[PDB]
Amino acid sequence: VQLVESGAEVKKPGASVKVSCKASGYTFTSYAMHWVRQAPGQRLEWMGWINAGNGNTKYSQKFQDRVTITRDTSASTAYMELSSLRSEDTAIYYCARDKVDDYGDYWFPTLWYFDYWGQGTLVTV
């Protein structure tokens, strides 16, 4: 089980940066793919999750109108798209997984959520 993201990206303020996480070593469709940011020297921050089984999503209120999360089942890749970027969005973006229930609904997490992360993606502006 390994989660691989894209390379670090540098964006001018007001632009939109899209990052990706590639899920290998496990059934992509059976897991929910979370996005967690961390400003340099700040705490972690949950952004939202994409239910790769059926594409359902839930974003943190702080990103509801800006962050977009999408999946490619065949590519086994999740996408994190944060438009209207600002100065404060300079931070390493991580991707963490969480198994969805037997029916792919994913409304209750598993106690061991975020067990596997990605190395993170650095976005600067």
Binding site: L44, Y94, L111, W112, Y113, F114, W117, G118
Partner: peptide, 18 residues
């Protein structure tokens, strides 16, 4: 749902407890 994450500098967090 209380989980503790250990993160070494320059690395992704590690799930220590859940």
């Amino acid at each position: 749902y209380v989980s503790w994450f250990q993160q070494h500098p320059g690395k992704a967090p590690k799930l220590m407890l859940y």
